Amino acid sequence: PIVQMVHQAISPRTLNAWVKVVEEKAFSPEVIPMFSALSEGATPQDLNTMLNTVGGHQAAMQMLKETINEEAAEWDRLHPVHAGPIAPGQMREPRGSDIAGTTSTLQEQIGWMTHNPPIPVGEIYKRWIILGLNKIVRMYSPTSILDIRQGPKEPFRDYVDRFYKTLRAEQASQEVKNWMTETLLVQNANPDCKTILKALGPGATLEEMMTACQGV
Amino acid sequence: PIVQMVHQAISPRTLNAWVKVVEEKAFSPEVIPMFSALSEGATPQDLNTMLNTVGGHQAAMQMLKETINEEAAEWDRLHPVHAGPIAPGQMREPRGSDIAGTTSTLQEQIGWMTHNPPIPVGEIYKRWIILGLNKIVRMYSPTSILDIRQGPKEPFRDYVDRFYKTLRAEQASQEVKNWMTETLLVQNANPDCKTILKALGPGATLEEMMTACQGV
Amino acid sequence: PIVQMVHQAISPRTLNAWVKVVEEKAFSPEVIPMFSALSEGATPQDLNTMLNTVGGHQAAMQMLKETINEEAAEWDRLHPVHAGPIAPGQMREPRGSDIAGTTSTLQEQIGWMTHNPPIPVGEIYKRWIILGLNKIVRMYSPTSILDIRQGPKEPFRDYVDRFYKTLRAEQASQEVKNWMTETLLVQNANPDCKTILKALGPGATLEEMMTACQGV
Amino acid sequence: PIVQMVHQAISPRTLNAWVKVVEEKAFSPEVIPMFSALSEGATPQDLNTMLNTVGGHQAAMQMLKETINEEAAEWDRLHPVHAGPIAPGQMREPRGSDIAGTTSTLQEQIGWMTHNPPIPVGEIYKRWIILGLNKIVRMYSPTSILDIRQGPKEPFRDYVDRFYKTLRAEQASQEVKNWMTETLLVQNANPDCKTILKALGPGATLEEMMTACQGV
Amino acid sequence: PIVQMVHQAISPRTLNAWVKVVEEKAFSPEVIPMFSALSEGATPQDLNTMLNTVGGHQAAMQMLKETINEEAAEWDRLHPVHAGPIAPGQMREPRGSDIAGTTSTLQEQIGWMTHNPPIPVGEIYKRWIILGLNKIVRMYSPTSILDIRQGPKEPFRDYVDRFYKTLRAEQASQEVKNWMTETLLVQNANPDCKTILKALGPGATLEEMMTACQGV
Amino acid sequence: PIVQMVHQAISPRTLNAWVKVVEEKAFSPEVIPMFSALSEGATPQDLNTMLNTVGGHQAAMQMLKETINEEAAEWDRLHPVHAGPIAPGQMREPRGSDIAGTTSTLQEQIGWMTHNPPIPVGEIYKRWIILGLNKIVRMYSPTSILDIRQGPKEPFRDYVDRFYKTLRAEQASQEVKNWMTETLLVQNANPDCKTILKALGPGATLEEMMTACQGV
Ligand SMILES: [Cl-]
Ligand SMILES: [Cl-]
Ligand SMILES: [Cl-]
Ligand SMILES: [Cl-]
Ligand SMILES: [Cl-]
Ligand SMILES: [Cl-]
Ligand SMILES: [Cl-]
Ligand SMILES: [Cl-]
Ligand SMILES: [Cl-]
Ligand SMILES: [Cl-]
Ligand SMILES: [Cl-]
Ligand SMILES: [Cl-]
Numbered sequence A, B, C, D, E, F: 001p002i003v004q005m006v007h008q009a010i011s012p013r014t015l016n017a018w019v020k021v022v023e024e025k026a027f028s029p030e031v032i033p034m035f036s037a038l039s040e041g042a043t044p045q046d047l048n049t050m051l052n053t054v055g056g057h058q059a060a061m062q063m064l065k066e067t068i069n070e071e072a073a074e075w076d077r078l079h080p081v082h083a084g085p086i087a088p089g090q091m092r093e094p095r096g097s098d099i100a101g102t103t104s105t106l107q108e109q110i111g112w113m114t115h116n117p118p119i120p121v122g123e124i125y126k127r128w129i130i131l132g133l134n135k136i137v138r139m140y141s142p143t144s145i146l147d148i149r150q151g152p153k154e155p156f157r158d159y160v161d162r163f164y165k166t167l168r169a170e171q172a173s174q175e176v177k178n179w180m181t182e183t184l185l186v187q188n189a190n191p192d193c194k195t196i197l198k199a200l201g202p203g204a205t206l207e208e209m210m211t212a213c214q215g216v
Helices: A012-025 A031-038 A044-052 A058-078 A106-114 A121-140 A156-168 A174-187 A191-200 A206-212 B012-025 B031-038 B044-052 B058-078 B106-114 B121-140 B156-168 B174-187 B191-200 B206-212 C012-025 C031-038 C044-052 C058-078 C106-114 C121-140 C156-168 C174-187 C191-200 C206-212 D012-025 D031-038 D044-052 D058-078 D106-114 D121-140 D156-168 D174-187 D191-200 D206-212 E012-025 E031-038 E044-052 E058-078 E106-114 E121-140 E156-168 E174-187 E191-200 E206-212 F012-025 F031-038 F044-052 F058-078 F106-114 F121-140 F156-168 F174-187 F191-200 F206-212
Strands: none
Touching: A012 A031, A012 A044, A012 B012, A012 D012, A012 D031, A031 A121, A031 B012, A031 B044, A044 A106, A044 A121, A044 D031, A058 A121, A058 D156, A058 D206, A106 A121, A121 D206, A156 A174, A156 A206, A156 B058, A174 A191, A191 A206, A206 B058, A206 B121, B012 B031, B012 B044, B012 C012, B031 B121, B031 C012, B031 C044, B044 B106, B044 B121, B058 B121, B106 B121, B156 B174, B156 B206, B156 C058, B174 B191, B191 B206, B206 C058, B206 C121, C012 C031, C012 C044, C012 E012, C031 C121, C031 E012, C031 E044, C044 C106, C044 C121, C058 C121, C106 C121, C156 C174, C156 C206, C156 E058, C174 C191, C191 C206, C206 E058, C206 E121, D012 D031, D012 D044, D012 F012, D012 F031, D031 D121, D044 D106, D044 D121, D044 F031, D058 D121, D058 F156, D058 F206, D106 D121, D121 F206, D156 D174, D156 D206, D174 D191, D191 D206, E012 E031, E012 E044, E012 F012, E031 E121, E031 F012, E031 F044, E044 E106, E044 E121, E058 E121, E106 E121, E156 E174, E156 E206, E156 F058, E174 E191, E191 E206, E206 F058, E206 F121, F012 F031, F012 F044, F031 F121, F044 F106, F044 F121, F058 F121, F106 F121, F156 F174, F156 F206, F174 F191, F191 F206
């Protein structure tokens, strides 16, 4: 990576941490923030390193490649490379494959990221990767948010855990996710607690809803 | 984070330490000082990282979001953003969402924190988070301080452990907590030790109270 | 902490090390040097961090608070704060609560410690804490030094281990501890070895005493 | 290694990490990116270190030596060393054995890598090593891509895992690997899912293919 | 410690390493080089830290105190402190107790070690400690070198291991240890191997002696 | 050690790593590259540290001492120390014992290594140590290369592992080791595979030989 801006190689325990995360948790939603955390300031070389060191899950890793290729193709459409000799004081325009690290050197990647103005190929490629990770996470989620219903003897707290866990893996914008909160959470509660929450009105906090069905 | 003031990415073992803390201890009172300890000099990006890497406990994490949103809304009320072009020498006013890291870049967060005078968005957001963590801890505490009573054969030392453990998780200011100490501790002791402590008078130290009921 | 004088946040494994020490060894005498070791150059913020991250032992932690408050009250008595506007070139007088970190900022704590002449609030508060730790250790020691007596078939070496272990936790100055060595050690040995040591005279080293009762 | 350009010795946990990788995973495809990751900025001395610290697998390590010798011999053919005294301001031409580290000193290796223009002996030798590692991985793969066929009750997702796992270890260029994807994957699926995928047409993504055979 | 010359606090894992060494290996000869290794550049404060963090073994730790006090008393005899006001440009003469760290501050210890000419109180105290450690190791060794005799079916290699292990813990100068090698090793071998070694003559290497009795 | 050229103490986990290597793997060939790896830039003090921290194996450690003494005696023969006062601008000539670290200070060792021209006592002593380590490894190898013969049902790959493992521990130059490869490997294969390899001719690679006897 590059620390704020001097270049550094990816650390053994960063590498190891990422490997263990995928081994232990597969593609559970929290893996993605972990990935981003472990890739702060990462060059495409470091990002590819993290991806390539994953054994197994090669259907997902292939899916991720395609997503990255789609995003790369789109970048090329919007940003066409122009014919001409790259002047002494300047550096060339990056393609999608240069951003994905496959067709660019470490020094070129360092060049784009540090040069003024900054061309953050690390952070661009990272967004493409996270995009592909979301597609995987969402596909690899077994349950739908519509199916999360509170059991008759289930403590509300456990139902809310399942609800927002499943919600975290849903393919939905924030406005849609807002609708799911205000509609489904109360709708799919068990009869006893459902009554209790309906009596609070449709503008009570989760704290208030959780403390309300705490006894029941 | 930023070390005293050069920017740095959050370390693998900081990340891992925070993850294990929540796994092992859930939301026991000591988790909060640990959080603060592990987030010293943290930017909103680093703070969000720590929060987002938590798997499970999504009812609490959602509660935390709402608290953060409430604190954000309050910040906006007190600090209204003004219309105008941000001059070359200056930086824009942060909103609550910029402080919560959701609508601000890493560079902007670095900008506010390092610029003179300092606009410590890291430390502001951290207070909001700790506020929300307290709401969770206090809600997730099973016992009330009123219910902590010494068993007939219970060593005083173990009763005082339970008392100040439960006290640590109570929703109460210091003055109220002072009242609980001077009132309940002696009140809820077992008959034999209760007599002993009453004889010391109402201005004896815990050391004196503990050593007094040490034999009994 | 501050490394010799640039400020730094407390490390994950410092934090973790302190936590494990208390978990594994409770308040055994060696915990205190460990605490001091792990808190070298620590600010009050770092010291409070270490204390607050302890789960359980809240009777002791409360005792420690009172001791710290007593030492704070005493500091205020000897050092009264004066009325007046703090000039541009100067910094305010610290109270006991500023030294205990509860009423002072990190920057103020950094200010006092680095400014010339040095006002070492870190090292002052640390002494108060160690004072309170001793009160706990000594109270939480089950045995008295008077009760350490050598068994009839006990190897002297094991008796000396028990003696100086129990001695380490005693409430006694060095002169009193010197008296205990020269009086009790030989006095409370078993008959066979007691005779042997009496024959050496009252000015023989522990090495000489241990090697003398090595065969017996 | 050399960090961007100051020289450094290879770290204990880099060393250990590489050792454990080979112990745990033998020569599974992901070992190679790990090797490269752990050898970022490595000198030939550091590269030889990593190779020599491997116990066992000495048939492979010998194979690797031969590959390295072949690449070394080829370098010498293309780059013949010229007779003459190396001037004060200059440094000598590296042979293949100098690149492989066997006939060059650490200082010479540092010299070539840092001097302008750069003579990256570290990165050249690394390519030769990775070349030899591929020969081993590919030879040590038990299965052929032609033999990966979906079981009648096998979830497609598991079949795609096996397919792209085995594909990763194949001796094939990208164009050949593209042909294998578009030809064999669908061809060797089980009857029920095979029909489903044929109906999508020959330009559907893996995401679309995987989600299509998700129910079946 | 002080790294070559900037001051630093003792690291968590240095501390922990020393603690585990004593727990696992007690006072086996190799502990002493480990101690010295872990205390490279250590101030008396750091040295006392390492010693004080040892739980158990308090007979030995007390023995060590006495040795340190003896060495301190001897230093004072040879180096008497003179009466007079310490000038602005100078620093005071250290006593034995200042060297042992008990009566000197960290800054004074830093002062003596860094000032020109150097007054290495760290390295002086370290020698006293190692002196006391040897007394302990040698006392705590169960066996004498005279008692190491080769069993009739014992492989010579195992006998030489026992011999030089026991030799390492002996109270003897190098000349005496040389005599033990050339005299006892061959003398105390078993009849079959004893004959073999006598035939080599009295100037053969251990390699030659070990390879000679390898078959037998 | 000294990092490229500022002095540093040997790290806890370097120390620990070396200790574990000897505990786990004794004197298996790969230990030697590990030693060298862990001793990059090491002073004689650091080298002695690593050697002295080994518990057990004292027959080997004694053998190593003798080898070091032999190499030291040889250095003294070739490099005789001259009589005269060492001038202010210069430093003294090192003896073998100064190189082995026994009769030289840390500062002298730093002096020789950093001064121009460089007198690399660290790297000289290291060669002597590795020389002595080879003598041990080779002596402690149970099997001869002549005795490695392929079993009738043994996969060739396992036979080649045993061959080059045993070869690695042999006392032989590269030319002799080349002869062993081209002569014995094929000679000592089992009848079925022996025939197969003879048919390839006497200039086929190990890759070709291994892939040839892969089916058989
Ligand atoms: Cl790869
Ligand atoms: Cl851009
Ligand atoms: Cl997230
Ligand atoms: Cl502000
Ligand atoms: Cl707290
Ligand atoms: Cl003061
Ligand atoms: Cl080797
Ligand atoms: Cl080149
Ligand atoms: Cl102590
Ligand atoms: Cl001196
Ligand atoms: Cl030693
Ligand atoms: Cl030389």
